[PDB]
Amino acid sequence: KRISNCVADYSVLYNSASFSTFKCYGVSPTKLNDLCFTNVYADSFVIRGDEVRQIAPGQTGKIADYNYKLPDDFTGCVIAWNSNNLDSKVGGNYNYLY
Amino acid sequence: QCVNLTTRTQLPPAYTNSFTRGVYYPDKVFRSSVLHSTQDLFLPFFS
Amino acid sequence: CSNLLLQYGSFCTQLNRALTGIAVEQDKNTQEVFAQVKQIYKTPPIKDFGGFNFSQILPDPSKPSKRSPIEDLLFNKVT
Amino acid sequence: GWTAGAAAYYVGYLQPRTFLLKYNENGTITDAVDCALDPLSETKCTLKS
Amino acid sequence: LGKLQDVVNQNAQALNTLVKQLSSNFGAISSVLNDILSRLDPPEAEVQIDRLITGRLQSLQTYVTQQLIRAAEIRASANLAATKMSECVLGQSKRVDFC
Amino acid sequence: LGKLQDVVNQNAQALNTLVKQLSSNFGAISSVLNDILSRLDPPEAEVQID
Amino acid sequence: RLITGRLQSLQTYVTQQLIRAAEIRASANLAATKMSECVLGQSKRVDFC
Amino acid sequence: LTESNKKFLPFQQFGRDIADTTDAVRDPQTLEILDITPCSFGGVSVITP
Amino acid sequence: LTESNKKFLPFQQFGRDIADTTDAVRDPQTLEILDITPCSFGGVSVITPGTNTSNQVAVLYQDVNCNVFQTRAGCLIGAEHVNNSYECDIPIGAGICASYQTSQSIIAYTMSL
Amino acid sequence: AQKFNGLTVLPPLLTDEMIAQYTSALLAGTITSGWTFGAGPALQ
Ligand SMILES: *[C@@H]1O[C@H](CO)[C@@H](O[C@@H]2O[C@H](CO)[C@@H](O)[C@H](O)[C@H]2NC(C)=O)[C@H](O)[C@H]1NC(C)=O
Ligand SMILES: *[C@@H]1O[C@H](CO)[C@@H](O)[C@H](O)[C@H]1NC(C)=O
Ligand SMILES: *[C@@H]1O[C@H](CO)[C@@H](O)[C@H](O)[C@H]1NC(C)=O
Numbered sequence: 001k002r003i004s005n006c007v008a009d010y011s012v013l014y015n016s017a018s019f020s021t022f023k024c025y026g027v028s029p030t031k032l033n034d035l036c037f038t039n040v041y042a043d044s045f046v047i048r049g050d051e052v053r054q055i056a057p058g059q060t061g062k063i064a065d066y067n068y069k070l071p072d073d074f075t076g077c078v079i080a081w082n083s084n085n086l087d088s089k090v091g092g093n094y095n096y097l098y
Numbered sequence: 099q100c101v102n103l104t105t106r107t108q109l110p111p112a113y114t115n116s117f118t119r120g121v122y123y124p125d126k127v128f129r130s131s132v133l134h135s136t137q138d139l140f141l142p143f144f145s
Numbered sequence: 146c147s148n149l150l151l152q153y154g155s156f157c158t159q160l161n162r163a164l165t166g167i168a169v170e171q172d173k174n175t176q177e178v179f180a181q182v183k184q185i186y187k188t189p190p191i192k193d194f195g196g197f198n199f200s201q202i203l204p205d206p207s208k209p210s211k212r213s214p215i216e217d218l219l220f221n222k223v224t
Numbered sequence: 225g226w227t228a229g230a231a232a233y234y235v236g237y238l239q240p241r242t243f244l245l246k247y248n249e250n251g252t253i254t255d256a257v258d259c260a261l262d263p264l265s266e267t268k269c270t271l272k273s
Numbered sequence: 274l275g276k277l278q279d280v281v282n283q284n285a286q287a288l289n290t291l292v293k294q295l296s297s298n299f300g301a302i303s304s305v306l307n308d309i310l311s312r313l314d315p316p317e318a319e320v321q322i323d324r325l326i327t328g329r330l331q332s333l334q335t336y337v338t339q340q341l342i343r344a345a346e347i348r349a350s351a352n353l354a355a356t357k358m359s360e361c362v363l364g365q366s367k368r369v370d371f372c
Numbered sequence: 373l374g375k376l377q378d379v380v381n382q383n384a385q386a387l388n389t390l391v392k393q394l395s396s397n398f399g400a401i402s403s404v405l406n407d408i409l410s411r412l413d414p415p416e417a418e419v420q421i422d
Numbered sequence: 423r424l425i426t427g428r429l430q431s432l433q434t435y436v437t438q439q440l441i442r443a444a445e446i447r448a449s450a451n452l453a454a455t456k457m458s459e460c461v462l463g464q465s466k467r468v469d470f471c
Numbered sequence: 472l473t474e475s476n477k478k479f480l481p482f483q484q485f486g487r488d489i490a491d492t493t494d495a496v497r498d499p500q501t502l503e504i505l506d507i508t509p510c511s512f513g514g515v516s517v518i519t520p
Numbered sequence: 521l522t523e524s525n526k527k528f529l530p531f532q533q534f535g536r537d538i539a540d541t542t543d544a545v546r547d548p549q550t551l552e553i554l555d556i557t558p559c560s561f562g563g564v565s566v567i568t569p570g571t572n573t574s575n576q577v578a579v580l581y582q583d584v585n586c587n588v589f590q591t592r593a594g595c596l597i598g599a600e601h602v603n604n605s606y607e608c609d610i611p612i613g614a615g616i617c618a619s620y621q622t623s624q625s626i627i628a629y630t631m632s633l
Numbered sequence: 634a635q636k637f638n639g640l641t642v643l644p645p646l647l648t649d650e651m652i653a654q655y656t657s658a659l660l661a662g663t664i665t666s667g668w669t670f671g672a673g674p675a676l677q
């Protein structure tokens with residue numbers, strides 16, 4: 001996703017009190033809105049609970065090296081939360097690939 | 099839609115020489131009375 | 146940036162003192178080359194020096210500047 | 225049977241080279257000097273003059 | 274003139290290069306210190322700002338050396354000019370091939 | 373005397389400042405090298421030593 | 423660290439060479455004056471030539 | 472932001488100098504060439520009798 | 521890999537020098553001693569007559585061994601060599617200069633004292 | 634040698650031959666003219 005010619009704050013994106021993990025190397029929350037960025041991109045995907053550890057700058061594995069390589073200057077904030085009541089179903093949900 | 103052409107006699111392509119051509123502004127800044135160098139994609143002179 | 150400069154605040158002490166020493170030495174160089182005499186000698190109004198023409202090195206009153214005609218050429222020659 | 229008038233178009237490919245750009249007081253480009261074309265042109269762009 | 278032009282051109286080139294130092298990263302991810310503070314947290318960006326301190330300190334430390342060396346040679350030049358002023362101008366010097 | 377006092381004071385202030393250089397951390401977490409060896413293991417405190 | 427380690431050896435040699443170039447120039451200037459006075463004439467400066 | 476006397480070509484947003492410092496920028500809306508000059512110059516000195 | 525004239529003791533493989541550089545190796549095929557010498561020496565240099573005088577230039581190599589004249593200070597190309605000697609203005613090295621004389625081209629000659 | 638790692642040595646503009654030829658002319662002028670050759674035209 002590309003966001004251009006738009007105004008977007010992030011206080012509403014943080015006070016939901018529902019995100020399980022919050023790995024944001026963009027800025028500290030108080031100083032992440034006063035300054036400017038040129039373009040905010042969105043890379044959304046699904047992953048298991050044992051592979052969120054490998055999504056970090058400077059780590060190896062089977063997902064962070066073969067699907068999405070994180071650079072050393074990975075300022076992209078990773079917001080992760082559990083929504084297992086919608087994207088999974090009984091009988092085996094195999095619609096997601098990796 | 100499109101149609102097809104028929105076989106006819108053409109002319110082979112020729113090769114000429116450029117003379118100080120293919121120079122553009124490499125950036126959107128203003129510079130006055132300065133001689134600066136940039137590393138971008140340009141057409142070589144006398145190529 | 147200034148908080149981490151305190152670990153190298155001693156380094157900035159010599160650099161400020163070296164340029165201060167350089168600047169005061171450049172100032173001191175001028176008085177050792179030009180200020181040999183402590184009395185300003187005025188050029189006499191009589192220009193009869195036995196045939197020696199001195200208008201080229203002595204200052205001229207035609208211009209507001211006190212520079213000689215060869216000094217004005219020297220001033221404009223170097224950027 | 226057709227006619228196309230008279231035209232001539234030139235196609236050239238760009239290469240990554242360092243170019244020395246000259247600017248006047250109006251801000252437009254007057255001349256350009258390459259660094260990998262001539263040894264004389266190399267001396268011009270290394271001396272930045 | 275060469276002796277009056279090199280002392281000015283060498284400064285302007287040396288003064289220009291100090292500006293050129295701030296345009297280099299010194300092995301960091303950015304040149305300006307404000308960017309890494311605005312795109313990374315200060316606890317994590319302490320390494321990048323520290324290598325910017327060392328790179329800019331060394332360039333300033335380098336710049337001080339040749340300025341001190343350039344101050345030394347002109348001090349020799351000013352001493353030579355002072356001796357020539359006291360001898361060749363303020364009297365007649367018997368030193369042959371000196372004035 | 374000015375030409376004789378500067379060559380002693382400048383040396384003395386240079387000798388004094390070398391002692392002052394050992395009181396700075398240079399971006400580390402301590403000034404004295406014995407402190408990090410006492411509270412941190414040498415495999416981990418190698419970067420602070422270097 | 424190898425780049426800055428090999429860098430740090432260079433200006434130490436360069437500053438050393440610049441100081442050595444300064445004293446050679448001072449010695450060359452002294453020899454030039456001795457050449458201009460002691461050889462190309464007779465110098466009245468006692469205990470100099 | 473002083474009133475300058477030099478105009479830009481109608482495709483450039485910034486403006487630099489010989490020392491490569493951005494000291495001129497045109498406004499996105501009113502297209503006004505406003506010069507940039509810092510305020511903090513030099514230090515302070517004390518005269519003691 | 522030049523053919524050296526120094527014989528190695530029959531228990532060694534490599535060979536160093538006063539400057540501590542591996543410049544001598546023994547080929548394990550039939551035990552011959554071969555020296556090691558780098559092929560890239562120095563850099564390039566360009567001779568320019570100056571503005572409003574000429575347009576052509578001469579290319580000088582610093583320590584590279586080879587219209588083209590093999591000078592003492594390397595290879596000089598683009599400048600002809602003349603046995604006559606005059607006063608020079610553009611220094612090159614080792615008592616040889618370059619100048620633009622008589623059309624007219626860039627010449628290289630020994631500097632006249 | 635010291636030239637195997639790119640630390641080349643630039644030969645001087647004046648070699649030992651013409652420096653010796655400088656000194657011979659300087660010696661010849663000193664013994665045949667005194668100091669007038671160093672302060673103008675060479676007398677005898
Ligand atoms: C000293 O030399 C200056 C040369 O600058 C003489 O001034 C020139 O005099 C001639 C004769 O009338 C004029 O045509 C020139 O225009 C003058 N030039 C300048 C720059 O003033 C001056 O006359 C000489 N004085 C004496 C006493 O010989
Ligand atoms: C270009 O500069 C000249 C001054 O040399 C000036 O007279 C002229 O008007 C300028 N061109 C434009 C389009 O303003
Ligand atoms: C340069 O190389 C040629 C051929 O390779 C050789 O004949 C010549 O002697 C070499 N020059 C020197 C100075 O060794």
Ligand SMILES: *[C@@H]1O[C@H](CO)[C@@H](O)[C@H](O)[C@H]1NC(C)=O
Pocket residue numbers: 601602603604
């Ligand atoms: C210069 O003259 C000498 C005289 O014997 C000759 O050997 C030499 O080849 C000449 N050089 C040229 C370039 O003609």
